[PDB]
């Protein structure tokens, strides 16, 4: 089944009739507008491309605008594809709303995780610190050994080292769908999803059970 594109609003909670507090991420899902249908004959695969949102004219380049004009829809903040299943079919300029999830029990949510900048091995890879005292010299959060000796005489690819952490694509799987409401452009899912308030989210029905 296709998914949809949305915006992370923030977290809050739903209280239930019998005392449970459900923590929910609030996801804003406005109509997704279909901007190109891809098929086997023309593209080698089946998919819809969608936009959502709105975009500043003066910020819409001409290439971008011709592509939107072709589909018969107004500009949106970006473009995303969702693969089609056999029997799945859509048409250019079609609107897809959040009611798509009305009876989907769980969804996977993809976002761009918050950025933590250049991170040391303690935070990035949960390395353990060496001694704070007992004579340790200048080596508390530093990484330790990064290899063996003459054999192999090199450091291995993949070695866990410090570097950029976050600001990457992350998918969190099988979150409960707590509420769908198209009149308010809302989807509530149970739990935390990746990203900062404001940033784009891809929501798809869960690939697992």
């Amino acid at each position: 089944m296709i998914g949809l594109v949305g915006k992370k609003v923030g977290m809050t909670r739903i209280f239930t009739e019998d005392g449970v507090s459900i923590p929910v991420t609030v996801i804003e899902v406005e109509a997704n507008r279909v901007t190109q249908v891809k098929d086997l004959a023309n593209d080698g695969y089946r998919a819809i491309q969608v936009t959502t949102g709105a975009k500043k004219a003066n910020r819409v380049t001409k290439p971008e605008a011709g592509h939107f004009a072709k589909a018969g829809v107004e500009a949106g903040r970006g473009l995303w594809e969702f693969r089609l299943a056999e029997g799945e079919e859509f048409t250019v300029g079609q609107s897809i709303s959040v009611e798509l999830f009305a009876d989907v029990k769980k969804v996977d949510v993809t976002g761009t995780s918050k950025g933590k900048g250049f991170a040391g091995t303690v935070k990035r890879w949960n390395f353990r610190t060496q001694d704070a005292t007992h004579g340790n010299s200048l080596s508390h959060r530093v990484p330790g050994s990064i290899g063996q000796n003459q054999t192999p005489g090199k450091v291995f690819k993949g070695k866990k080292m410090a570097g950029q952490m976050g600001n990457e694509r992350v998918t969190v799987q099988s979150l409960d769908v707590v509420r769908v409401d198209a009149e308010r452009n809302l989807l509530l899912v149970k739990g935390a999803v990746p990203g900062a308030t404001g940033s784009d989210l891809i929501v798809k029905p869960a690939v697992k059970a």
């Binding site: 909670r13 209280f15 005392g19 449970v20 507090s21």
Partner: protein, 123 residues
């Protein structure tokens, strides 16, 4: 949130007064026990003519902690100290015959029903 070396008061008439946790049971590298969890203890002080003695090695269930317990609406119940109830090493059933101070409904197990019945108060 009890670990090795932690000291606990004792919420029964077993005669123990102060016990130390020498193992958090229930899994490899398991760090903490909380309300409802079983620990291994050594007895550091006991009264003169009770059911157990200083230096005895046994089990106990934790029934009050400072870290507390979370309830499903987000609430917290915290206690001013850590206490446990002594348990037979093998049967893991209570040594004492009376229970002191409040306990929590997290104990409602087949196993700890006797502790909640005896407790003055149940939170």
């Amino acid at each position: 949130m009890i670990q090795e070396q932690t000291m606990l008061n004792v919420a029964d008439n077993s005669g123990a007064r102060r016990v130390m946790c020498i193992k958090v049971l229930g899994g490899s590298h398991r760090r903490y026990a909380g309300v409802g969890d079983i620990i291994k203890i050594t007895i550091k002080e006991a009264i003169p003519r009770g059911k157990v003695k200083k230096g005895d090695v046994l089990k106990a269930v934790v029934v009050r902690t400072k870290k507390g317990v979370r309830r499903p609406d987000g609430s917290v119940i915290r206690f001013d100290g850590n206490a446990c109830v002594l348990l037979n090493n093998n049967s893991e059933q209570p040594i004492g015959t009376r229970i002191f101070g409040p306990v929590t409904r997290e104990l409602r197990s087949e196993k700890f029903m006797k502790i909640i019945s005896l407790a003055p108060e149940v939170l």
